[PDB]
Design a protein around this ligand. Structure first.
Ligand code: HEM
Ligand code: HEM
Ligand SMILES: CCCCCCCCO[C@@H]1O[C@H](CO)[C@@H](O)[C@H](O)[C@H]1O
Ligand SMILES: CCCCCCCCO[C@@H]1O[C@H](CO)[C@@H](O)[C@H](O)[C@H]1O
Ligand SMILES: CCCCCCCCO[C@@H]1O[C@H](CO)[C@@H](O)[C@H](O)[C@H]1O
Ligand SMILES: C[C@@H](C(=O)O)c1ccc(-c2ccccc2)c(F)c1
Ligand SMILES: C[C@@H](C(=O)O)c1ccc(-c2ccccc2)c(F)c1
Ligand SMILES: CC(=O)N[C@@H]1[C@@H](O)[C@H](O)[C@@H](CO)O[C@H]1O
Ligand SMILES: CC(=O)N[C@@H]1[C@@H](O)[C@H](O)[C@@H](CO)O[C@H]1O
Ligand SMILES: CC(=O)N[C@@H]1[C@@H](O)[C@H](O)[C@@H](CO)O[C@H]1O
Ligand SMILES: CC(=O)N[C@@H]1[C@@H](O)[C@H](O)[C@@H](CO)O[C@H]1O
Ligand SMILES: CC(=O)N[C@@H]1[C@@H](O)[C@H](O)[C@@H](CO)O[C@H]1O
Ligand SMILES: CC(=O)N[C@@H]1[C@@H](O)[C@H](O)[C@@H](CO)O[C@H]1O
Ligand SMILES: CC(=O)N[C@@H]1[C@@H](O)[C@H](O)[C@@H](CO)O[C@H]1O
Ligand SMILES: CC(=O)N[C@@H]1[C@@H](O)[C@H](O)[C@@H](CO)O[C@H]1O
Lengths: 552, 552
């Protein structure tokens, strides 16, 4: 019915219904015109003949190690490059946001309501004939079928890039401050109203909760000592609501401030590290500022840890998963002479694409022992038994699984992966090809071009029947990996834009904030500007265990 | 104690304590350096020698009517000018925000917490020796004394600019969607979490409330017919909470959606106009879109009314109060090639400066009759008796009072004006001269330079004793007016930046939103781009009564 169902408008033009059976395209600012925004303006034809493809650019970035090594030591150039990556990725995101689960037209409710995840492409109208609009059968393939045929893991497939468990758990810990689905509401609703890197997973989403985790002395977070070691305080001591199975002994119910973080020792590990880091920064600030009271110590520390997080997320985490020889840079000043919006809203599709469960192993090897999921889950006593040092050491040593390439989703979390398919559809996502087009990729012409192999492709073609109806979630996990890479094109070309906006669109990166005073002086500012995953573990973990997001 | 009390840092540099008795200035990006950021960089010395003063620029803008008349008809120039006014005003506001009642250092709580009004200058530390930091006596002059000596009105003083009661009630109606102090919390806390022009005063702040005001047919707001005329529905019909004295008859309790708007027929007038305008836009959208359902009609209409409001607020309201011969422009595209943040946060100081009660007359003349405050307050039957037409006619005819120039605050609202003084101090505002410095004005050197006269100046000098301790609120109302103007320099030089950010930093002004499809097509877009206070009254009010913000 809805004449817009076929998603006729191209190149980011917007489709609007003009009567029951006709439509119109708003080609404004697209660089195109015509009934569908398919015919290019002049300058557009040139830009197109000069735009290297994602894969081309990707090759250049992962080869010529000798040349990059030289560039990386010319500030004028490194900066010039990083600036480009930042701006060119960002113009891909709508800021301020538009569209959410319930609104496929622009609307104020959509903009104002912070409870929704925003949406990079509008949902498919509720009254379209097929789930993807017009193409395909009345019903999408059985999710159980897709799961089992192309997703589930037979034999564990290690990541060729060397991603270890430090990387996998950091990914899980970090993203879980801004992916916090509100299930009381539905998928598509978030509980993280910060919509970004505000460290709510350390400090708590609400004021009431933060106060319960706080010591109110020297700006510090409450903590306990077990052995000679610092761990978070108990639910009993703080009364902060945490999610634990009823069988968990009272002294093992840790607080930390993202309620879900008790369910995996790997999460509880980072929670501890960061808690230690905060109190560490407090002792530093208190030395430079004997006149400062409890509140400002705490507030300044949180601002510093936010800095540290972004610094590390860009220069170590992203650095690693990118595979680039070019040395990425966290430098807010690169943006001070550019058009850029210091705001952000986390997109449903970012959440969806970030379900990297293939990273998980079949057992968790905390050097010495090997634990199954059942043993590992909600079992902090493991953390206490081994200590942080063993753990860092063990998790740095263990390879995580390859994400793209198909058939690597651990059976232990199959319910999750199915849910991902089901909720994708519940939220009315558009097709894989529609998202590719949305992000300046060329659409796939065959399941075989998507996977880069023959078997899974045939299996998919039997279920979906038409490449143009292939769903976004599955395609991501099944997509042909870049050469010796962990992800395919789609993952990286949707992810980077979402990721960099959430990173750089943080108030502390804005000119008013980005100055020494903001962080208690040159000494606190340095804490941000020299932060690394390595030093985070070095300053806070008992030995000074070597780490990396990289299995050496 | 707090070594930062003396506000030693100049030119917008930030002061930070570095030990109990010493301080440091962060001169980052100010254009200055040195212990206090007082000594200019080179390019700064030049910019300074070329910066015409506010009064100079103001002269040029209000004279040469012949030249402006020519410029106003050269698009390339009008646009070029408007662009400049927009960008140059805006760089005066911190965006994203910083500082609020409780935070004089940068902090995350300050940034994240939408319940606070933000603050253009930090508060004075709770442990400073004097209220203004270091200067002045242990205590500020008695508020009752300042009120009575220089504020209260003896003889009504009409505005030399011709501002009428249409202007005064529009100002009150318009600003009361974003000035909504939460008295449960304190001054310095707001209830309008939209922080800007979101038309919550028509539609309601919450979803629950909006639904109660909605008809759920053709996108329309609920309404009743009395006589043959459209007025808002009753509290009884909708159950929407409204503030009315207990003696008000049930059929006179109107709904509208800003709970306070029942307390003045001038407010209830605009509320009705805008309600009519919404349903008018719905009938239009329904014609261009027979396929559209209730929700999208409603949502698109609200987006259009938001446009109309900003269009009118800039090209008629601001136009009028400015006194400029230059024809201001509402054109979001003027910013598309500039650095500008499409966000906003309403500042406590904006609230404070906008207390324009001097505008009010001694009696409200609804042509024929003359009502006192007691008669006018919470008395909608007046609105019913006369109708909208008489009212528009009457209010266009009646001059409002001059705001600056001293001694024009109606005795009827003296409690309010005192409150303003008291709450200013409760919230720890800095001195008038500190705010002047903050907005690139030269500080006043004598009460006599501030007022431009002898009597009130001597009266003030006896109370405050030192010009550097003169409070911001009183100074605004007492300040020497620009020539035949309603406001002085300070009012206009603080106001414009706050006002324009709130206006242009609205999502609909951002490139993604500013296109025809957003508003249901070319026909809806036009409704925005041709809106005027005149046509608003023309399309909605029974005759087609002539109006203006201007007593002719
Ligand atoms: C032992 C390790 C892990 C376990 C036990 C686990 C299990 C789960 C479970 C039970 C859910 C909730 C599913 C639902 O509510 O439908 C979930 C969601 C999710 N998982 Fe994992 N997972 C693990 C590791 C990871 C890792 C390493 C990542 C890396 C990014 C990740 C990414 C996500 C994301 C983004 C969600 C979205 C949930 C939300 O929006 O709150 N997970 N996982
Ligand atoms: C009959 C006309 C008016 C009456 C009876 C009136 C009275 C009041 C009252 C009772 C308050 C709240 C007192 C308090 O919250 O402590 C207030 C606040 C305020 N008034 Fe008016 N006033 C009138 C007209 C105006 C006009 C024409 C303006 C033009 C701008 C204006 C600007 C403001 C502002 C900005 C506030 C503070 C808003 C808030 O935080 O709630 N008022 N006035
Ligand atoms: C080749 C080394 C310098 C340039 C690095 C650019 C990093 C990201 O470049 C990306 O390339 C894609 C295709 O060109 C585009 O679609 C993206 O918009 C762009 O961000
Ligand atoms: C994780 C293993 C259990 C679920 C798979 C059963 C349903 C279909 O899985 C089949 O089995 C083989 C797997 O190697 C493939 O060769 C087939 O192509 C695949 O379709
Ligand atoms: C001759 C100039 C034509 C009108 C343009 C000026 C628009 C506003 O000019 C204002 O002037 C003040 C002092 O220079 C500054 O405080 C502001 O930065 C600026 O916005
Ligand atoms: C370095 C940068 C880039 O290539 O532009 C980048 C940023 C973020 C990512 C990323 C981050 C998280 C998920 C998916 C992708 C990326 F793959 C590359
Ligand atoms: C025209 C423009 C300007 O001078 O830059 C302008 C904008 C807003 C205002 C204004 C608006 C509200 C309160 C105080 C001042 C102004 F007086 C002038
Ligand atoms: C000028 C042009 O290309 N017209 C196309 C038409 O062929 C197609 O049927 C329709 C639906 O996608 O989109 C439009
Ligand atoms: C959403 C939020 O945290 N808002 C807080 C509020 O709860 C608190 O009572 C007040 C004190 O600062 O500040 C604000
Ligand atoms: C969640 C929380 O701590 N709120 C408390 C509340 O009791 C108090 O009234 C308010 C001040 O406005 O903030 C504080
Ligand atoms: C619930 C569960 O699996 N129990 C485990 C147990 O096997 C293991 O000995 C211990 C390690 O400290 O952790 C607990
Ligand atoms: C170099 C300079 O101007 N330093 C001044 C200092 O002389 C003065 O005592 C103080 C007053 O606030 O401000 C600072
Ligand atoms: C603050 C706000 O308006 N939140 C709303 C909430 O009432 C509603 O449950 C949901 C569904 O529209 O959207 C969100
Ligand atoms: C999706 C969701 O949260 N639904 C709620 C609904 O149950 C409630 O009645 C309404 C009131 O505003 O807000 C919305
Ligand atoms: C509140 C009050 O004083 N009552 C007035 C009354 O004096 C006046 O005659 C009437 C005209 O409609 O408006 C009502």
């Amino acid at each position: 019915a809805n004449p817009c169902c076929s998603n006729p408008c191209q190149n980011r033009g917007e489709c609007m219904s003009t009567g029951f059976d006709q439509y119109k395209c708003d080609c404004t600012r697209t660089g195109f015109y015509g009934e569908n925004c398919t015919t290019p303006e002049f300058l557009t034809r040139i830009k197109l003949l000069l735009k290297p493809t994602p894969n081309t650019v990707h090759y250049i970035l992962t080869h010529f190690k000798g040349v990059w090594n030289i560039v990386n030591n010319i500030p004028f150039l490194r900066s010039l490059i990083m600036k480009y990556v930042l701006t060119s990725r960002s113009y891909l995101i709508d800021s301020p946001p538009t569209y959410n689960v319930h609104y496929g037209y622009k609307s104020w409710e959509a903009f104002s309501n912070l409870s929704y995840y925003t949406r990079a492409l509008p949902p498919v109208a509720d009254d379209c004939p097929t789930p993807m609009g017009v193409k395909g059968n009345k019903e999408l393939p059985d999710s159980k079928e897709v799961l089992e045929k192309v997703l589930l893991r037979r034999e564990f497939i290690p990541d060729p890039q060397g991603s270890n468990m430090m990387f996998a758990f950091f990914a899980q810990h970090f993203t879980h401050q801004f992916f916090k689905t509100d299930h009381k509401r539905g998928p598509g609703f978030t509980r993280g109203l910060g919509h970004g890197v505000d460290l709510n997973h350390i400090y708590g989403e609400t004021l009431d909760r933060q106060h319960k985790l706080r010591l109110f002395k020297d700006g510090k977070l409450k903590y306990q000592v077990i052995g000679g070691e610092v761990y978070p305080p108990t639910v009993k001591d703080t009364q902060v609501e945490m999610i634990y199975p009823p069988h968990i002994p009272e002294n093992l119910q840790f607080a930390v401030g993202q309620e879900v973080f008790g369910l995996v020792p790997g999460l509880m590990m980072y929670a501890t590290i960061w808690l230690r880091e905060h109190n560490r920064v407090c002792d530093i600030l208190k030395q430079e500022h004997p006149e400062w009271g409890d509140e400002q110590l705490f507030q300044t520390s949180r601002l510093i840890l936010i800095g540290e997080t972004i610094k590390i997320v860009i220069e170590d985490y992203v650095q690693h998963l990118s595979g680039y020889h070019f040395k990425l840079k966290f430098d807010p000043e690169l943006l001070f002479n550019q058009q850029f919006q210091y705001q952000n809203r986390i997109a449903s599709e970012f959440n969806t694409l970030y379900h990297w469960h293939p990273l998980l192993p079949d057992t968790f090897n905390i050097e010495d022992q090997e634990y199954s999921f059942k043993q590992f889950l909600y079992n902090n006593s493991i953390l206490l038994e081994h200590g942080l040092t063993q753990f860092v050491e063990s998790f740095t040593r263990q390879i995580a699984g390859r994400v793209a390439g198909g058939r690597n989703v651990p059976i232990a979390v199959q319910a999750v992966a199915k849910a991902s398919i089901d909720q994708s559809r519940e939220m009315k996502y558009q097709s894989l090809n529609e998202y590719r087009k949305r992000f300046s990729l060329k659409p796939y012409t065959s399941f075989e071009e998507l996977t880069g192999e023959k078997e899974m492709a045939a299996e998919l073609k039997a279920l979906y029947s038409d490449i143009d109806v292939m769903e976004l979630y599955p395609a991501l996990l099944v997509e042909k990996p870049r050469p010796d890479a962990i992800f395919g094109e789609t993952m990286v070309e949707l992810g980077a834009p979402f990721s960099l906006k959430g990173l750089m669109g943080n108030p502390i990166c804005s000119p008013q904030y980005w100055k020494p005073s903001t962080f208690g002086g040159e000494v606190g500012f340095k804490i941000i500007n020299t932060a690394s995953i390595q030093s985070l573990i070095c300053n806070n973990v008992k030995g000074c265990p070597f780490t990396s997001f990289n299995v050496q």
